[PDB]
Design a protein around this ligand. Sequence first.
Ligand code: HEM
Ligand code: HEM
Ligand SMILES: *[C@@H]1O[C@H](CO)[C@@H](O[C@@H]2O[C@H](CO)[C@@H](O)[C@H](O)[C@H]2NC(C)=O)[C@H](O)[C@H]1NC(C)=O
Ligand SMILES: *[C@@H]1O[C@H](CO)[C@@H](O[C@@H]2O[C@H](CO)[C@@H](O)[C@H](O)[C@H]2NC(C)=O)[C@H](O)[C@H]1NC(C)=O
Ligand code: BOG
Ligand code: BOG
Ligand code: ISF
Ligand code: ISF
Ligand code: NAG
Ligand code: NAG
Ligand code: NAG
Ligand code: NAG
Lengths: 551, 551
Amino acid sequence: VNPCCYYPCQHQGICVRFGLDRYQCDCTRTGYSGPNCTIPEIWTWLRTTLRPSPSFIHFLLTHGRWLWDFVNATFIRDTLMRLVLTVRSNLIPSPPTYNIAHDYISWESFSNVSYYTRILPSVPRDCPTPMGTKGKKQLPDAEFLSRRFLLRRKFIPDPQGTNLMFAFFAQHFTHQFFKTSGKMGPGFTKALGHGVDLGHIYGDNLERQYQLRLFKDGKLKYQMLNGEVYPPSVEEAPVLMHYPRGIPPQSQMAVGQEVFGLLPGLMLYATIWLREHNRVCDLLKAEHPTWGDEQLFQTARLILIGETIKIVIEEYVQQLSGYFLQLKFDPELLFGAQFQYRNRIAMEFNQLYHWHPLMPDSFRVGPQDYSYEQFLFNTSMLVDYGVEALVDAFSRQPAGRIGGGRNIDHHILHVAVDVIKESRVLRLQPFNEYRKRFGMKPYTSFQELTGEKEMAAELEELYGDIDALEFYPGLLLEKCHPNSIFGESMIEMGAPFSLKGLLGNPICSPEYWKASTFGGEVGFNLVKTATLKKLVCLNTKTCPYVSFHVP
Amino acid sequence: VNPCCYYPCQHQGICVRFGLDRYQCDCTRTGYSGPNCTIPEIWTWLRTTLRPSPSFIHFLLTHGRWLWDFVNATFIRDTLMRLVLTVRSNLIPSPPTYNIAHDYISWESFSNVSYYTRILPSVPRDCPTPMGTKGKKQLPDAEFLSRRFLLRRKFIPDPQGTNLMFAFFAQHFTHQFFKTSGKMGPGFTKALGHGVDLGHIYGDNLERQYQLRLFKDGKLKYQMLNGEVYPPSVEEAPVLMHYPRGIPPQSQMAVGQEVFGLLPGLMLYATIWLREHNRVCDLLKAEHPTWGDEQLFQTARLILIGETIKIVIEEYVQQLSGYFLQLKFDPELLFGAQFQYRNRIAMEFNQLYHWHPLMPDSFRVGPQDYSYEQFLFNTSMLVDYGVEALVDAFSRQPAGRIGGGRNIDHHILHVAVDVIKESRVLRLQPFNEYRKRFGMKPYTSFQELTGEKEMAAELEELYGDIDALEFYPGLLLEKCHPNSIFGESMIEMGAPFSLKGLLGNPICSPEYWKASTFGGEVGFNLVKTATLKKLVCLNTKTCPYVSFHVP
Ligand code: HEM
Ligand code: HEM
Ligand SMILES: *[C@@H]1O[C@H](CO)[C@@H](O[C@@H]2O[C@H](CO)[C@@H](O)[C@H](O)[C@H]2NC(C)=O)[C@H](O)[C@H]1NC(C)=O
Ligand SMILES: *[C@@H]1O[C@H](CO)[C@@H](O[C@@H]2O[C@H](CO)[C@@H](O)[C@H](O)[C@H]2NC(C)=O)[C@H](O)[C@H]1NC(C)=O
Ligand SMILES: CCCCCCCCO[C@@H]1O[C@H](CO)[C@@H](O)[C@H](O)[C@H]1O
Ligand SMILES: CCCCCCCCO[C@@H]1O[C@H](CO)[C@@H](O)[C@H](O)[C@H]1O
Ligand SMILES: C[C@H](C(=O)O)c1ccc(C(=O)c2ccc(I)s2)cc1
Ligand SMILES: C[C@H](C(=O)O)c1ccc(C(=O)c2ccc(I)s2)cc1
Ligand SMILES: *[C@@H]1O[C@H](CO)[C@@H](O)[C@H](O)[C@H]1NC(C)=O
Ligand SMILES: *[C@@H]1O[C@H](CO)[C@@H](O)[C@H](O)[C@H]1NC(C)=O
Ligand SMILES: *[C@@H]1O[C@H](CO)[C@@H](O)[C@H](O)[C@H]1NC(C)=O
Ligand SMILES: *[C@@H]1O[C@H](CO)[C@@H](O)[C@H](O)[C@H]1NC(C)=O
């Protein structure tokens, strides 16, 4: 058997095969010694024997509002903010390591950017069972596995008060770096850029960008309907979009992210950001009459990227976490750190961000309550209701709890079925392994994972071994934190992939984080001040209730 | 006039235009304050008032062999080696800044890797004279300018004893990152990789690589002639090559760098490296029977990249510098430093590495002395003479002095004429500006630049102002260091671009510098031990006199 199937190398050690039956673990810089990287170094031993559980930490970060308010008011905020940023980032390797093609470092993996990278090499195709050594020879039927534990029976809403506005933002946002190539196969993304390049607004390639560009004042092509700014028509900006056959070009909006047409929530956020872009263009021109299109454009995109990273950290992440510590976006907290300003989208991170449970049962827009079949490809809802209205509604409708189990509306349950299958094609390792890898203890039983005895029992009879429980199912079924949108792992594995892909963006480097980069103080501040409310209300006739938190 | 034409922003400050007549300097992190980034900070003031001249430093680094031998034997070697590596690197920005398209930071410049980057933004197209403010409205006629001061009259040989072996190595090596796109125009390179990706051996794109791959044992396709290994035929590996019309595919060698066919010296080094690749493949297989083609291949390429960086630093750079300090390649000296493992080929660095003066008058291969017209496209010399012989000869023939003036053999004088023109298309700034930028004082007169009164006088009447003297001409005409191959600037501007593009390679990061990366101790050591002699003699029947120094 492939010795490496036993996953012999602990603490990030590398399993190198030798002979036709041997193996050697590479524990370089692992902080452990031994044949399997286990004998720790004294310091490593301390460092670990003292790390308070993720649970304890979470507890502290969500209690003592009073004590926290003081902290937030002192320099300690910055200190903890810097701690989080670094300590969270070291879990993510840079330059990247493997890909679906090479379960070893290789120049090709490092340079061919069409591949989604991965943290842990696949379960070798020559192992006994599919998950390696443990588990059954046949994995649970995805479909079944889904209808049994992921299928929403009764809508459990998210306790944190997360609404639809957040769900759509998340969806919209994540679709700038998760863009799997259907023609290429799993493990291949079209989102070269591998981060927040704001490419769902400008298109993922020059041609497409040029198509959407106005080529005057740094502006972005657009159109007026009911005397309001909405993205241009596919007729005006003839760019490839995904709309069902039969819908005319004169009824389709050209945007950048081909898929964004199949859901008002998306086209909504796509309208706000466009409006915002053209707006920043006007400011820049005032300040720089001498500037040309390209420069104004290029500058505007840089200002928006700043805005995005800001709102994502201080509001979006602040909400998802539920922490009392006021998170902060200040690229300078890292100027002391040893941090590589570079990111690469991991296949693991894509799965782990398949938050479909957020979608409600029905979509209510005022007294009117629309069905999935009325929402899903509705080409009118946006122009009909308009930005302000839709925002107010989405800002009021609460989304579902992400973790916990059985809360994915049947209209999209298929997606999760697919995610499971795809994970298998990718040959992702077992949940329990990832647990370890991202700094956690592996679960000892199914009843430990879920906080109960019922599901735990079935999962046990289905999988056979907890060390066989897969990634996504383990992620979604693991018991939720007290009053949280998800549980320990979703955050403890996702946070790193998240903050790295945020601070790792080049505009966060000391080279780019200069005011000149954004056209001067005006551009810079725009970034330093960005807020979900300003984003909306400065591009809308009236300012609605706008928030990520349900009122 | 464009205020920025006056180059108002000192010490790396950024000149931002405002209004239709204003400008603001961005001195963020420059270490200076003021309207033009001039009022220094106390520390900055000290740091600078104490930096010993480049000249003094050079003097020390080339004297007291005795004292140096001791240093080399102590830990001080490592310390200075680390100092050099960092202090030299900070001069080069990362992520990169501008390109021929954007004289401002921009997402496109940062992501569109087809552009050669630049350190200093172009002389604005709206300036009074071509170099900005000073100088004449018409720049000296390249051709003339060349026949007058660059045209070799009598072969001045390089004093450092640099031979042809070094000249060919340099040429071969640099043609892996300097590969300007003729169809695209100046400022566009085909060498995406922007560094030592050893792509002149594997081709600059998947298809081409696959074409040259044997697809068995990690090997590279090849052929036998006179019972010896030489690159395959264009017939065998049907890859695009540049040979004059009329030469048959069965007489052309497929290699990776399309141009390498027009000069034995190149195809020589291309044969050695190929032989080396297949050799490392055999070692790897012994150790890893279980390994497949791709892995063996991918691993072999990583081992060679290591070998290359090693030989380039400890031997090639050791020779060009002439220092007594034994240079050292140990990726770990930077593991403490704040260093970004990323590189991007600058147009300035390409010019500055146009060492054509190295080429001799005639090419002597034993008692036989060949002419340029017998050497230049000779498809037989390599197979005829064979590796060993050619090496011995090239290792004995001394190359020319690079700096100083009038030492470029007329057969290739055209190249330098072109370089000058191209620099103008790129709109490169004045030599004197680059001097400052790379930490030097600007020349006050032409007679200060050249160490004399004759040429200085003409250059003065031609250019009009020293602050108008261009990049390349200034680079080549500037007076040479005591007994050096070139002068102050060539090294003080080139070294940074050089060491950054060397240590910046991903295999030098803590993530990749593990023994597992190279297949184990065997692969690793191969890297840690690489030497120009081993490179040759382990792939040749007999070991000739092989060195970068003429005997
Ligand atoms: C009613 C709204 C939504 C529907 C109908 C929906 C549906 C889908 C579908 C059909 C896919 C394609 C993969 C497949 O099913 O085979 C997908 C992928 C995905 N969805 Fe959604 N989604 C919605 C909301 C969201 C939300 C709220 C998020 C969470 C941020 C999200 C995150 C993802 C991610 C990241 C992928 C991966 C895309 C890729 O591989 O490129 N989706 N979704
Ligand atoms: C007899 C041998 C050599 C000849 C015939 C030669 C000729 C040329 C020619 C024709 C070009 C193309 C640009 C033009 O002329 O318009 C060129 C470019 C260049 N050469 Fe050579 N060369 C030789 C040796 C070397 C050496 C020793 C070096 C020094 C390392 C070198 C460095 C360069 C560089 C870096 C470029 C830039 C290529 C690019 O832009 O992609 N060459 N050389
Ligand atoms: C990046 O990697 C992918 C996968 O290796 C490359 O795509 C394949 O390339 C080979 C050779 O051109 C073809 O035989 C395949 O049909 C290609 N497609 C797929 C889906 O494998 C891709 O060419 C690489 N990209 C670059 C720029 O090197
Ligand atoms: C990288 O930049 C170059 C130059 O901007 C791009 O090349 C041009 O692209 C536009 C739009 O496709 C064309 O109109 C030009 O004819 C292209 N060629 C040149 C020489 O300008 C190139 O497409 C960019 N590459 C990527 C991957 O974005
Ligand atoms: C109250 C103190 C706040 C410190 C927050 C540090 C960032 C969160 O700390 C996290 O703790 C977990 C357990 O060690 C690990 O899994 C994560 O890798 C680590 O970054
Ligand atoms: C004998 C001490 C050796 C120290 C070598 C440090 C590396 C070379 O030092 C160089 O000196 C020049 C003048 O300050 C500058 O132009 C370079 O940027 C700097 O790196
Ligand atoms: C700061 C906080 C933390 O690291 O604790 C934090 C940071 C980032 C996130 C985050 O965006 C995400 C965590 C998991 C997914 I999928 S996104 C969640 C929490
Ligand atoms: C270590 C030494 C130094 O920095 O002084 C040094 C380092 C690198 C080089 C070097 O390779 C080059 C300098 C100029 C060109 I063009 S290549 C020359 C000298
Ligand atoms: C290393 O791991 C393998 C597989 O788990 C095991 O057989 C072996 O005993 C381990 N060795 C040590 C010292 O733990
Ligand atoms: C689209 O939404 C509108 C409201 O904007 C609604 O009246 C209409 O029926 C919807 N269209 C479909 C096909 O459901
Ligand atoms: C700044 O530079 C400009 C142009 O060289 C000059 O006119 C001006 O006097 C300078 N100001 C200062 C304070 O040096
Ligand atoms: C090529 O070199 C050989 C020696 O290898 C020489 O005899 C021959 O004449 C050369 N060919 C040309 C065209 O000069």
